[PDB]
Amino acid sequence: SQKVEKTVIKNETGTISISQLNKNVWVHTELGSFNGEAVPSNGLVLNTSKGLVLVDSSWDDKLTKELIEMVEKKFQKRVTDVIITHAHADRIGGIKTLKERGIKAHSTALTAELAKKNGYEEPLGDLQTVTNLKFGNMKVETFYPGKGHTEDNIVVWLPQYNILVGGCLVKSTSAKDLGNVADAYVNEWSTSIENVLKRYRNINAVVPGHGEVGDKGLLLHTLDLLK
Numbered sequence: 001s002q003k004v005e006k007t008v009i010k011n012e013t014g015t016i017s018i019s020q021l022n023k024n025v026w027v028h029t030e031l032g033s034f035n036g037e038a039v040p041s042n043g044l045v046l047n048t049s050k051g052l053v054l055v056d057s058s059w060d061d062k063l064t065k066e067l068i069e070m071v072e073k074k075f076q077k078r079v080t081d082v083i084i085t086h087a088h089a090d091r092i093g094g095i096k097t098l099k100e101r102g103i104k105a106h107s108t109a110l111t112a113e114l115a116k117k118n119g120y121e122e123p124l125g126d127l128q129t130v131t132n133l134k135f136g137n138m139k140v141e142t143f144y145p146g147k148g149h150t151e152d153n154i155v156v157w158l159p160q161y162n163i164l165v166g167g168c169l170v171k172s173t174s175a176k177d178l179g180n181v182a183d184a185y186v187n188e189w190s191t192s193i194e195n196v197l198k199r200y201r202n203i204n205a206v207v208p209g210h211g212e213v214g215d216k217g218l219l220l221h222t223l224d225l226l227k
């Protein structure tokens, strides 16, 4: 009888929020913790018929669980697939839970090479620079403009909605710099972004590594700080 009239999906705690980009895709944002502060990591939920999908897992298995025990009933679809942009706590951080239940972490051969270097699991890694994926009525093509946020940092592209997932590689409007370039290549970063605005210019919406979806303006944003 009693119900609210909202679109997004924010749990009682308010840590995990999923905004519906349209009617077949959402943006799951898992809030972590920077030791006293909050670290909201946006994402992308694909509403397919073959199974639910989320771009980049949660910070830690502790968070991922709360994200899988909420979307599995809210979306009416069980998660069994996840796209990995690179090797980071905001990507495969919760892979431990994705490779325990039955979630295939699609990634590039390299993504499954540097992942263990940090102590993470081993994803599919059966991807490449430019490839086409199919998750049942859900087409997802990747892209490797070069080195930037990581050694295999890539950007998920969706030709079904012209949506792009710049990820950490592409800073958000609410950013002042890249921050932490130890595991990244600022020498190729500016070179990778320029490729996402020269080749994959056509974008209806871009989702950075943190914050929310926007536009191509996020691409030039990275170079505006990593310059």
Ligand SMILES: [Zn+2]
Pocket: 086, 087, 088, 089, 090, 149, 168, 209
């Ligand atoms: Zn990252």
Ligand SMILES: [Zn+2]
Pocket: 088, 090, 168, 209, 210
């Ligand atoms: Zn990040």
